[PDB]
Amino acid sequence: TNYLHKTLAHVPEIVERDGSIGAWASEGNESGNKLFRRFRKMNARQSKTFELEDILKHHWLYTSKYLQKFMEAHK
DNA sequence: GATCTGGCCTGTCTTACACAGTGGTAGTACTCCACTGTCTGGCTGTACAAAAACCCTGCAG
Ligand SMILES: [Ca+2]
């Protein structure tokens, strides 16, 4: 199998070269994609002409540091 | 005697139409920017009384 081959043959090379792996996890996008699941439910327009547009808007809004910083609010 | 076919019902599906919502927009109406004076009422240094509910005490029973 593939990943097995990667991990028994190719781990050391990349770990040597590009600093760190798992650092570049795809985990983030897929894992977070459940946000695209929920946003469609709650804040839809709704009409697919807009459904994207407003979903993307809310998403990026939820994504910037700035509002996350203001969400922490002194721990 | 034993079976065909319209007349009529209803149980099942289906199809228009209604609400349901949501971010965007327009139309509307209710809150102040700032100027200037100016009146009203609640704070501050002790003194005099007025009410008030319990407590003692006399004296009445
Ligand atoms: Ca995946």
From Swiss-Prot:
Transmembrane segments: none
Binding site for a divalent metal cation: E30
Tissue and organ expression note: In the adult, predominantly expressed in the thymus with lower levels in the pronephros, mesonephros and ovary.
Cell location: Nucleus
Assembly and binders: Homodimer. Component of the RAG complex composed of core components rag1 and rag2.
Domain comment (free text): The RING-type zinc finger mediates the E3 ubiquitin-protein ligase activity. The NBD (nonamer binding) DNA-binding domain mediates the specific binding to the nonamer RSS motif by forming a tightly interwoven homodimer that binds and synapses 2 nonamer elements, with each NBD making contact with both DNA molecules. Each RSS is composed of well-conserved heptamer (consensus 5'-CACAGTG-3') and nonamer (consensus 5'-ACAAAAACC-3') sequences separated by a spacer of either 12 bp or 23 bp.
Family: Belongs to the RAG1 family.
Function: Catalytic component of the RAG complex, a multiprotein complex that mediates the DNA cleavage phase during V(D)J recombination. V(D)J recombination assembles a diverse repertoire of immunoglobulin and T-cell receptor genes in developing B and T lymphocytes through rearrangement of different V (variable), in some cases D (diversity), and J (joining) gene segments. In the RAG complex, RAG1 mediates the DNA-binding to the conserved recombination signal sequences (RSS) and catalyzes the DNA cleavage activities by introducing a double-strand break between the RSS and the adjacent coding segment.
Entry protein name: V(D)J recombination-activating protein 1
Residues of the full protein shown: 955 to 1029 of 1057
